[PDB]
Symmetry: C4
Subunit: 388 residues, 4 copies
């Protein structure tokens, strides 16, 4: 086996096709399905799998009560076969904790989990299913990371972490790992003013991460990483097509180097593919809550502060609950280009559906097509009343 190199460009994105869907909440009404949240997708050279943070209980289990909670000792990063639900019997534990990332470098997989109390959390870096390196909290305020896959080039796998305030300046670091060992880290540079939950993908240009500004911005910060030089830059998506949630209405001029104002101290993990005229942005349909999901083709969104959509695709109707979303690609697929993919977390239960005492989710996932495919919409599909 050899380390994977990012040698291809993105395939032309003309629409999105269904890739995976687990119907976890439907099935979990009567099966031993683990309560999860913060899911993602990540590929090995021979298999692609679903990932999420378990809550250490099934949905029907009485311990599902209180699972709106973010950071218990009962959480772990688990993975399971593509489009199956996360069950007690099919889920593989990657590491223990309440914030994670994971990626395959072509030879083996690195997984990182953070655990601990708010003022004393630590990351453990696993490589080829063994713990290799550990990182202590540097700001003593909820050390946290991507909640979707990292990306590797020639064995080097950059990861974005943040430690510090969720509502003011924080201490963000980019770490560069190889075989689970720390090669280097650096403090965030550039014009992004707050960074959380980066969604990343790689292509010949380098590694691109679209993150969330939880503090003041409703445009998304972007970190661009060179995995060879092990350096990065940051800014915001310039486009006035705003993609955080909640968010103001779309103006006609966006902001490249500062948060677009209107909504403070909140946000949702999201993603984009920034590729000149082949640029597509994901966002919730609602500007107020985590409901609906759509993709919008916004040429040069990264650099053009006047850019608007010229094409789109609804993924989840506004009437249906969405949640976190993030990027991944099958770096080991055949062909001359990397096919852009993404997942959407479909959150069920609390806080929006409070007749149940749990919070969980299912997953839907799409990849790009060079065809102009007809669109459907993809709800979680569970009926809350059945759980009462």
């Amino acid at each position: 086996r050899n380390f994977n190199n990012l040698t291809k460009g993105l395939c032309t994105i003309n629409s999105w096709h269904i890739y995976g869907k687990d119907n976890a909440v439907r099935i979990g009404e009567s099966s031993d399905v683990l309560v999860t949240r913060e899911p993602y997708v990540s590929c090995d050279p021979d298999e692609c799998r679903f990932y999420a943070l378990s809550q250490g209980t099934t949905i029907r289990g009485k311990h599902s009560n209180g699972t709106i909670h973010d950071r218990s000792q009962y959480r772990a990063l688990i993975s399971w076969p593509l489009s199956s639900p996360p069950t007690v019997y099919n889920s593989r534990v990657e590491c223990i904790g309440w914030s994670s990332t994971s990626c395959h470098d072509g030879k083996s997989r690195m997984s990182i989990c953070i655990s601990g109390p708010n003022n004393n959390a630590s990351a453990v870096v696993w490589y080829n299913r063994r713990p290799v390196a550990e990182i202590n909290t540097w700001a003593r305020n909820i050390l946290r990371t991507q909640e979707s896959e990292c990306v590797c080039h020639n064995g080097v796998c950059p990861v974005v972490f943040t430690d510090g305030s969720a509502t003011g300046p924080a201490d963000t670091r980019i770490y560069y790992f190889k075989e689970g060992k720390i090669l280097k880290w650096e403090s965030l540079t550039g014009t992004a003013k707050h960074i959380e939950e980066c969604s990343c993908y790689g292509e010949r240009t380098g590694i691109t991460c679209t993150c969330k500004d939880n503090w003041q911005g409703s445009n998304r910060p972007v970190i661009q990483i060179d995995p060879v030089a092990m350096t990065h830059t940051s800014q915001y998506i310039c486009s006035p097509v705003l993609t955080d949630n909640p968010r103001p209405n779309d103006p006609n001029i966006g902001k490249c180097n500062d948060p677009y104002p209107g909504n403070n101290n909140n946000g949702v993990k999201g993603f984009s593919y920034l590729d000149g005229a082949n640029t597509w942005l994901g966002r919730t349909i609602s500007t107020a809550s985590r409901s609906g999901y759509e993709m919008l083709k916004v040429p040069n969104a990264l650099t053009d502060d006047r850019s608007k959509p010229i094409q789109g695709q609804t993924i989840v109707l506004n009437a249906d609950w969405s949640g976190y979303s993030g990027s991944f690609m099958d770096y080991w697929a055949e062909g001359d280009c990397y096919r852009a993919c993404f997942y959407v977390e479909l959150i069920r239960g609390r806080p929006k559906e409070d007749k149940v005492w749990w919070t969980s989710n299912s997953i839907v996932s799409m990849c790009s097509s060079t065809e102009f495919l007809g669109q459907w919409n993809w709800p979680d599909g569970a009926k809350i009343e059945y759980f009462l």
Copy 2:
């Protein structure tokens, strides 16, 4: 590994022996068995597996309510080990959608799933467990395909699709795939007037598909495909032994090039093995409903419009519910001939058994023997009353 070539003839069929049976509905009364329909069987070079369209819920789950429905977002093609039931914990998702086919070419498996609304459906073609090609609806009216396995020769795997009316002329296409890529497609030619749900098998003569005419015919249309030239012909089974359901009583003269009249706008997926004096036809015993199943040896059924049975075998008693049936063979078995096999879907629940609110099925499967074996009958075996 090499691509499989269709180098053998069919084994002489003198009777049928039990091959597989999953008892899924019996077991699912108290186990996490997924609700399915439209099942089939398909072999890899090292394993044969059961396939079906899941409904994204177990039978005992409250979401089983309403599963008579054909095309939800919660359906997926799943596969699972031969004669095991389709459980949450043992089922592998091949792709997402509500109409499917799948086949191994000797090197890897191609699976195709169609999803979408009626007017905007699309096929995604997967090869070696990755999405490779996509096909948009061409008639905007329920793009649909075989619901049983396709067949490959030297890497070329033909698949029959239909888009358009179920009750009038429609747009049927034969696609030719290799490694999931589209080599060619062509519009239906020949005398078949309506084509749905083709059941196919291969042998040195080429690929033979027995389909369903949903519009006017109660004889079955046949498509014969040359996978090297990538061309086909079509007609009907000439025999007056009629094999659709519902259907008129058997006359003494059949129809080779037009639908045999009497029953309109309905039908069931079925199959035959058309091999001169070694010809066997499957059909429901009832002419009115999907109940019973029998095999009948009808020499030269394809070409002889006077042909009648000379031997037969009951598979399912008329007192028991049947359903879809289709062909498959183990192309990788030892020996000098291909052993003909088939499955019968045993539908339980709605619409025929409406005291439950679900629709599901189990599977029984047979292969041919050169012996003249004694016959049994093979019911689903579940007691509906237990589910109340």
Copy 3:
């Protein structure tokens, strides 16, 4: 891989040690454990597994009602990992039917299942998980076979079948298979007057089978098979230590060439290891019913009509229900001898425990030691009251 040859003698048997136990009925009180009966054990070159005939329902499932029944369409030979219980999710179906045998030849496994009505049953012979040969009933009266493993030498695997009366002369045949194909069969010869459910093992001397005479005998018939010449002889165990059930009390003179009288038209599957001074016989402790199990060292039991025990070991107390028992060995273990092993079926439910409506079992298994080990007793361990 090479075919296994029977090149070793039996290890000296000085006691028996615990080998496996699945506690299936205990666990099945609250888990998806399949109802079974007629279990056995059989080894591959890399793994040993438990085998049994499923009834196509779990114990807690409502379809467990009526499982005292021997021969439904819902039965199948399943296998599962050593000492695990037979669950819906871990059981591999080998073939469909209600009477079976199975054995590995060193390269692949042959499994045989018989299915059908009483007057029209048939065997299907599977090799390397594919159907290869079929055998129709020859006497039209419940074609039936060993219900424990067969044994192979240089690719030749003999199997004993019986078709015909259970209460008078029947038609017993010994078949010789290689790669699932029929090399030869022959009618029973020798002095055994009725043969059912042979338990077999192999060693340099050939293949030895201890069977059951269901008609008149309470001593056990023995068939000795030469797998090279493909010939056999038969007689009874000469010893007055009688080992069928039910049975008369032990006399002082046994019978070598005729049934020992007293009990007609009943019996239980059993086994022995016949090895001169290293001979050990298994039997139920009760002479009236299937309760208890003990091993007795009876020198030259096969040939000495006065032979009595000189050592023994209780396996199951008389207070606890037993059932079928049979022989197997790990032919692929290291060392200079084959270690004798056996299983005992521990039947729970009907007819003896009729407060439940089901019949099932668990398994306990022992192998021999050259040590003189202390003895325990090994009950099924389930409490019937829990199932009410």
Copy 4:
């Protein structure tokens, strides 16, 4: 494959990081999780797994009633994937019995289980999943062994056994196995006065075991084994930091060659890493009961009868139930040193929580870091009230 040699020293232990946690009792409230106790962890060259003694029933099963019991016929050593819970469907049975050890030698795994009545117990030694050797009780009083992993060097795997009184002088033996065969055994020598449940680890210095004195001592006995010479010595941890439970308060002078007095006829399995200035001891926080767990850095604890802690880490709060603890390491990890690891059994149910009728546990596990990591605490996390 080659036998592993103990060529490395221990990594410097500056703190402990989370390694694994199964949340078994939480999950088992609504899933088919087996009741266990006496768990441990052990690595193969390609995977690390959790181990424990099953009770042959799930927690929700009615047979969980009475599982405080130590030695039934329904117990077995099982293993299952790291941090998954021990379920009916994912647990692999290693051998049958109620006292165990297991270890991989670099080529294959040896597992040992003891079963039998108190006066007639016996060990069966399994190697590469086959029974190889057996050892009869020598003192006829509950033959028993480590309840955590053994350690191997160049194919030789020492194991400590005890047979005889729990409350007076007993007969302890050290056995030396290779490929499951007995090379040698010897009677305990040295100054340790009573030995049970040794927790062992290996490094270039040899094999170090920290055991329990059940008779008079609240300091822990230590056995140091040379796996090449196949000889050993014994004494006690000299440190006045006492680590058994229950135990007296810590004095200022410990005892090197005799039990430290105050508590008789009780104890708990525990462990330490004895490595000069890199020495760390584990213990319950409570001196009265199995509650809490902490690690304490006690330089030269083995040899210094005045030694006190200079650093520590809380693992489980005193408010939470703990239980057995033991050592293991991944001998096949990359790097220049062996990373010390340990598990803590978190016992739930009887005798401390008697509103339920069962006794079970979950597992938490840590390994060492060269960083000074922030500490969390790791409770079982189940709510007993949910089980009522």
